[PDB]
Amino acid sequence: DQICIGYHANNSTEKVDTILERNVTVTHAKDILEKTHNGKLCKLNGIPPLELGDCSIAGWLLGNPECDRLLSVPEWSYIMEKENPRDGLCYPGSFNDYEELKHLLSSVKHFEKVKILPKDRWTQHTTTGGSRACAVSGNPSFFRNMVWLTKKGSNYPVAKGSYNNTSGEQMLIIWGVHHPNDETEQRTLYQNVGTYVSVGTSTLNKRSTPDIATRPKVNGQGGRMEFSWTLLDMWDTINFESTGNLIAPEYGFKISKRGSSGIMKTEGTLENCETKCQTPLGAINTTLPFHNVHPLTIGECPKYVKSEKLVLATGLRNVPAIAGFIEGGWQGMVDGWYGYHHSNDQGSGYAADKESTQKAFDGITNKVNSVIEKMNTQFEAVGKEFSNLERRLENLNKKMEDGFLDVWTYNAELLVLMENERTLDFHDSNVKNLYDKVRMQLRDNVKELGNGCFEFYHKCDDECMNSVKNGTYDYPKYEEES
Amino acid sequence: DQICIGYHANNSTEKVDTILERNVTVTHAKDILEKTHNGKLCKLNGIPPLELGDCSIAGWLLGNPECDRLLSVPEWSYIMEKENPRDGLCYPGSFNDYEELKHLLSSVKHFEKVKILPKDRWTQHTTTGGSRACAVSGNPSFFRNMVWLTKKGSNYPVAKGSYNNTSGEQMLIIWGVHHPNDETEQRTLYQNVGTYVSVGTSTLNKRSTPDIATRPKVNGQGGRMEFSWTLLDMWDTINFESTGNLIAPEYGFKISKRGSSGIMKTEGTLENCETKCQTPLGAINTTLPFHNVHPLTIGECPKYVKSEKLVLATGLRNVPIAGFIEGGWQGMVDGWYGYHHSNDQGSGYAADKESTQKAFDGITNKVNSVIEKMNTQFEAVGKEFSNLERRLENLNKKMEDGFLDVWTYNAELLVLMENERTLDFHDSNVKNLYDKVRMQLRDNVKELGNGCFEFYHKCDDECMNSVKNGTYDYPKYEEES
Amino acid sequence: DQICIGYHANNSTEKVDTILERNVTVTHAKDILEKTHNGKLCKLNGIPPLELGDCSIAGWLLGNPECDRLLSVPEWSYIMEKENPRDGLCYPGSFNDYEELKHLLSSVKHFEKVKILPKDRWTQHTTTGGSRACAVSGNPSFFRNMVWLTKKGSNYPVAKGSYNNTSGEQMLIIWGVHHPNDETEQRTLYQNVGTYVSVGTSTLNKRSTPDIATRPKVNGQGGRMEFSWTLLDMWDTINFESTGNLIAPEYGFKISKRGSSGIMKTEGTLENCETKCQTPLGAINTTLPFHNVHPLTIGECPKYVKSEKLVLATGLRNVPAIAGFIEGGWQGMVDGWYGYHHSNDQGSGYAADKESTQKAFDGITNKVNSVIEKMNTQFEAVGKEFSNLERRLENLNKKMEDGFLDVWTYNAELLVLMENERTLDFHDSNVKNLYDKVRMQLRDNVKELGNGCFEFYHKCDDECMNSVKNGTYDYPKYEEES
Amino acid sequence: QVQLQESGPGLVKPSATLSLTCTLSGGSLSTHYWSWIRQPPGKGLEYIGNIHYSGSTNYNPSLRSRVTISVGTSKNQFSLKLTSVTAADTAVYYCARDAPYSDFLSGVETGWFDPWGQGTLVIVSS
Amino acid sequence: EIVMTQSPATLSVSPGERATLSCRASQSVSSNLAWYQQKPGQAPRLLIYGASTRATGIPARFSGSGSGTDFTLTISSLQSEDFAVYSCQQYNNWPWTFGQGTKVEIK
Ligand SMILES: *[C@@H]1O[C@H](CO[C@@H]2O[C@@H](C)[C@@H](O)[C@@H](O)[C@@H]2O)[C@@H](O[C@@H]2O[C@H](CO)[C@@H](O)[C@H](O)[C@H]2NC(C)=O)[C@H](O)[C@H]1NC(C)=O
Ligand SMILES: *[C@@H]1O[C@H](CO[C@@H]2O[C@@H](C)[C@@H](O)[C@@H](O)[C@@H]2O)[C@@H](O[C@@H]2O[C@H](CO)[C@@H](O)[C@H](O)[C@H]2NC(C)=O)[C@H](O)[C@H]1NC(C)=O
Ligand SMILES: *[C@@H]1O[C@H](CO[C@@H]2O[C@@H](C)[C@@H](O)[C@@H](O)[C@@H]2O)[C@@H](O[C@@H]2O[C@H](CO)[C@@H](O)[C@H](O)[C@H]2NC(C)=O)[C@H](O)[C@H]1NC(C)=O
Ligand SMILES: *[C@@H]1O[C@H](CO)[C@@H](O)[C@H](O)[C@H]1NC(C)=O
Ligand SMILES: *[C@@H]1O[C@H](CO)[C@@H](O)[C@H](O)[C@H]1NC(C)=O
Ligand SMILES: *[C@@H]1O[C@H](CO)[C@@H](O)[C@H](O)[C@H]1NC(C)=O
Ligand SMILES: *[C@@H]1O[C@H](CO)[C@@H](O)[C@H](O)[C@H]1NC(C)=O
Ligand SMILES: *[C@@H]1O[C@H](CO)[C@@H](O)[C@H](O)[C@H]1NC(C)=O
Ligand SMILES: *[C@@H]1O[C@H](CO)[C@@H](O)[C@H](O)[C@H]1NC(C)=O
Ligand SMILES: *[C@@H]1O[C@H](CO)[C@@H](O)[C@H](O)[C@H]1NC(C)=O
Ligand SMILES: *[C@@H]1O[C@H](CO)[C@@H](O)[C@H](O)[C@H]1NC(C)=O
Ligand SMILES: *[C@@H]1O[C@H](CO)[C@@H](O)[C@H](O)[C@H]1NC(C)=O
Ligand SMILES: *[C@@H]1O[C@H](CO)[C@@H](O)[C@H](O)[C@H]1NC(C)=O
């Protein structure tokens, strides 16, 4: 008697925006923006972070006596540095090219501490000096990986030593220069005043002299230590020479892994969980192309965007029996998106048009996958350190990141809105196409009712309805009863 | 008798491009690119700029005698620095980390000049030196915020002084070193030759010695003064010590505001107009997402693009007893889509208000999506680089050009893609009325092939004002055929 | 009797991707990604490159004796520097601001070597020094554009000289300082030990003292030469003063062209071909908006993308007689994309609907040109040099370039997929529009057959069908035979 | 501050080894260098040498062949071993702490002794 | 070594009077000289170090100066508690050395 063409509706409250419309309820939707992390600092790729606790990188490498827990450090996946750490240069001072060193340590992971210039090789020098500022259990002490060479007997013979890098890999060497508060200190500790410190390799040629001056006291000391560093290439030799004010390394650091990592600023601790993408706020476990958790993320991560939601429609407008697509609302049809409602002598009921639904389905699936699969995910560390004398460079870096963030956010927002507009138009087109696909086959044997349904002039039984539904209706056989 | 479905046309000459078509005339359009500024340098957010006139930043802060008008400066919204200024380091010299200082002064606005080391504290020294290079009315002079310490009597006692920053905020301190042309000059001014200047704080440890050498004369002098600066953190102390060649600050500068600003390069003056966005060519007053006035703009501004026009169609193609098939209903001024009826009571045009309003709201939302999704933020944009930082300047340029090409390309294609969809949208909407109506009229009408329906049944004003409302009572008209 | 509306199909395997569908086979397509270079290093814009052979920039400008072939270099379009060249600083040393100099030389092209301080002006000095390190045919030698000033007889009078830049353009001046391995060497060569070198201009104020120290030997020598450079602005004067250890320039370099160029790293040679765009792998001759050959390209080039294929559909789905657009496949119609197939008493055959095809054609042409013509092509060199102490900056630069590459690749991939989806949807719409354009005119004088064809009730000959094809069917005259 | 007390036999043979200890009270060795000083009757003081907690030592060049200074494990004691006593070694032996450079720096040479102890007189005889 | 010679062997300076003691080095000791006060029955006490720097716990009546080879110790007004043997120490060489001791006694 009658066959209608219509579409699926359900109880969904999911909403999407489109270019032309806002707050459109749809039957199905896909959220492509990750919003939730787990609140924990996790092992990255199964490898724990280097937890410095209250130590800075300089404190760690020099051997600040309060960083003893870091004297032997296992391979790390990232470094967790507390912002504004306490244990750094206990004996007040400064560290040259510190930001470059922190950057160097990013692509490092494990390194081996190697003794290069054993403390007891320094005969004819006093190697027992220390300071209350670095005291351990009351007793004055010093950086543990460094030797403070001072006068012995009544002399300071030229201090010399060298090291040939036969360790198997490029090595990090740190040394420094003492800068006394006054002349009395300079003479008491080194005998001579007109001193210098000279260090070099096949590429390094650095010579400096102490700057004796009154300075504000820091940690009780009016003096300062200046530290610097180089990388000694494999098979090269580093020479040291001094007539005073030299703080020699005892140890160097052989880089062992040279992998890809970074330094995270965080006050937390390791929670013994695992991730592939770690932000300072917690780990992100997601397969989505975008996230909005935190920009300073270390790992293989989704793009960070400023958006709050990015939701693709995948379904039909959710528009809540004897009418077709014109009115919508077939909540009684749960077989597929597009279909038929037939009524005849044997009975009535809903059926999906499986060919139409599957094609529409595959189309939507491919569209969603294009949006997601075309996004390029790479390992990144993001954060960079700058000194207070590098503000133009720091700002350039910030501007670059803000620039890319606005580009990606804008594109994510419009890609979603433009695609949702096409998705809903696509589905409206597909139901209309069944209406006409069928109308063109039924031709003059039916009456168009104006509501998305066709009335048969001839009697149409369940075998007839099956024939109409899969497109095999035999027009000539039914040119009767009119 | 007859009802037609058609659409609005008018006398518009506005044109748009689409992805498939070029120079398409439309009934309505919106220009989303701002092209006009006012030609003036305006107060920004009600606050005037600092007008340096012919002074450089160094001239201003050191106290070049020709910059007296800048000794006391009220709060400013931006700095107008003339490119290639005249009044700078009158006594020839150089200024270290000058680009970093200019950058620092961007996020500053007002600051207070504070006396830190009063000239008269320098007893046992001569504080009355000067040079013809900085002369005022012939008389030799010097930078007004600086003290040139030279020999007194026959001695140069070690010069010392210090300052504890108890001013209430982080302070800028500038000092320098004199570099003689020769030894005679060094002895005449400082007695000793083996001199040094030492300056420091809890973070600064700077020591240098004069470099005595013959140099080409600049502004008549073969000597040079080297200036440098630091920021003294709140509650820290800066110490100065010298055995000669020290030019001590008398004053330091307390930062007062630390707001968002920038330095503009311009030869103009303040015209006392007001803006929210200022380019070197004039102020921009607009609500549009893009502009093409100038890339070095200070303020909360539209994105700068290289495009010449960005125009969105909002309307229908303007294409001047037939329907949408022929178009041209210039006689219908009620809405975008509508009806034309003719019967025995009368004839005339009417809009389909339901269809027109929905299309209208759609277009409005589309336009707002394009505009509202653009992120507008305050920027200073310009940066200074030294002649030894060419690679960094070039990197900075590349970054800016890169983003500009990305935004221009996207603006151009977003407009073309949207205009193609807009026009397709309107064509779809008028066709949808044709079928919405065809489907309720069904067999009681004849399609004429030109977007009109002829009724078999006589159809009067009440009938026409039923079909137009989507309520044609089909079963009552099944007659007269 | 019958007229059908349908479309073109052919023998084609061109495939495109769309947002909804992958591998649609189309009747026509355009590849907009350039994948092939010619394998050669070409003259750029008709001007040969500067082939340095095994020389470095420092070796070239200083006059390394093994770079004699470069003492009279003609104008170049780009510089070809071998990566890791050998003919560098023969006498071991360092070159300050070397990366800045290499950058400076990018926007230079030709320069003239100008004698500034002739070797024989240095009376009262020995100008015949040299070293086995730079030896030519055994005999000790030195950098040819430099003068090593050493003790004459028993004295080293203060060495002085100057040059006023009256050459006509900004000049590059190189000079250096010798750093002895020990004090014996210092006295043997310069008599005095407490020496300095002082150089200056109206903007340059530099003084430096020798650093005497034991160093690892390089090329047999424990000594080092440190070179530095400045640009002497036109009409300024550079003064030199030394009490020892000065290596004076004999020659300066006058910049002659100052055009845009760059430095390419390559082991190849000039092949005597010509291009407008050159990569290290070969030259690129193309008009397409994107290429995927190499990112370090010098010239006016397409955007580099990470994609493998960017192909726009221009044609119809290629979908291989008595049916219309419903079935498709009119391989017998080669007149245009859209058209008619008619059969009547006089004859039968295919014809294009020229009005419809030309409009669709122009539309597709404009679409393709929009995608290509809106891309901004500018001269670029891309590559930059960084020192080993500038890793944060080198990485910032890399990151910037990678960032832009991901943006352009992503946009290229989606622009192509969105446009291909619209292209095919466009063609389907246009064919249907003929179907309805015709249906609406024929009205009741035809039977719609449901397969994209109409059957006339009235006999319709080869003048009637032409009237239909014209859109001028005179409906009222055919109201008969039904 | 600390007090130092010398202890040991007051009688040594003419061919012998002399051995004296020094005990600290009110403190411990604490990174400082500790010294022994001798005063033969009728003579001025003679410096013998010192020792750091770590075992580093400095001896008067004239007595190197006969002198050992050691600490042990109590961390508040140190001792002097003088070999080949010829009785020219009759003297008052004193222990002392080398003055520290400053409250902040230690473990460095100074050369003046601030805390001294009464001393013990050792007679070498038979 | 550096011989430190004191003179006179004894002073007879009476209570209330200024007492001046001298020390002369065979080699320059710069400013690296200390003075000690020794009494029968007790440990020597440090009075001065660094030629002129007073040791703590020492009254202002004690002062001294000198450089190179020529040094003195001065008691501005001698009290009964100051009758002691005083000595100088050299610490600008190795070994460190001491003078023979100058006794202050009452006339
Ligand atoms: C620094 O050491 C390298 C390496 O020395 C060799 O390998 C060590 C592990 C150890 O076994 C040494 O005894 C070996 O000699 C020196 O480089 C070698 O130099 C010799 C002599 O010219 C040469 O024959 C070898 O092939 C070189 N080996 C390598 C790996 O380069 C280097 O000379 C030493 N540097 C200095 C300043 O002494
Ligand atoms: C530099 O000055 C600060 C501040 O000193 C106080 O505030 C001044 C305005 C004035 O009223 C002074 O007399 C005050 O003492 C010094 O920091 C203070 O140090 C004292 C210990 O001496 C401490 O109790 C206070 O809390 C500190 N105040 C603050 C704000 O931190 C600082 O030590 C001085 N630096 C130098 C080198 O002198
Ligand atoms: C450096 O040389 C310039 C140029 O000198 C002139 O041009 C030369 C090619 C040659 O022909 C000279 O004899 C000429 O005098 C000097 O600049 C000129 O200085 C005079 C003042 O003495 C001035 O009147 C001219 O206008 C200047 N010309 C230009 C082009 O600026 C400059 O002074 C010389 N520098 C030194 C330190 O001597
Ligand atoms: C929506 O329907 C689903 C499945 O039909 C059911 O599980 C769920 O409880 C329903 N929710 C609402 C809000 O109706
Ligand atoms: C869409 O819904 C949100 C609440 O979920 C509301 O805040 C917003 O204003 C709505 N927007 C429109 C255009 O109605
Ligand atoms: C992410 O979540 C899935 C469950 O959806 C879980 O199987 C997987 O282990 C999680 N990943 C990590 C790193 O914990
Ligand atoms: C399609 O429907 C007809 C009628 O029921 C049926 O005979 C046929 O098997 C179905 N599928 C096809 C096309 O084989
Ligand atoms: C169109 O007509 C209006 C009056 O209705 C007039 O104001 C306007 O300027 C005219 N526009 C054009 C382009 O002629
Ligand atoms: C569009 O109009 C502009 C301005 O008159 C003209 O320069 C351009 O060539 C025109 N383009 C086309 C395709 O007609
Ligand atoms: C900017 O334009 C608006 C009208 O759109 C006007 O009301 C406002 O006063 C203008 N502001 C300035 C500074 O010109
Ligand atoms: C396709 O057919 C044309 C003739 O119409 C012929 O020129 C061309 O080579 C053929 N291409 C293929 C792949 O067979
Ligand atoms: C598209 O064709 C290519 C080439 O034959 C093939 O590798 C790819 O898997 C195909 N795509 C899909 C979805 O099958
Ligand atoms: C580039 O290709 C064109 C054909 O499109 C050809 O005529 C020209 O000679 C080619 N140029 C080079 C340098 O290969």
TrEMBL record, chain B:
Species of origin: Influenza A virus (strain A/Singapore/1/1957 H2N2)
Gene Ontology molecular-function annotations: host cell surface receptor binding
Disulfide bonds: 55-67, 277-301, 459-463
Coiled-coil blocks: 371-405
Record keyword Isomerase present: no
Protein name (database record): Hemagglutinin
Subcellular location: Host apical cell membrane; Virion membrane
GO cellular component, one term: virion membrane
InterPro entries: Capsid_hemagglutn, Hemagglutn_HA1_a/b_dom_sf, Hemagglutn_influenz_A, Hemagglutn_influenz_A/B
GO biological process: clathrin-dependent endocytosis of virus by host cell; fusion of virus membrane with host endosome membrane; fusion of virus membrane with host plasma membrane; viral budding from plasma membrane; virion attachment to host cell
Description of how the protein assembles with itself and partners: Homotrimer of disulfide-linked HA1-HA2.
Superkingdom of origin: Viruses
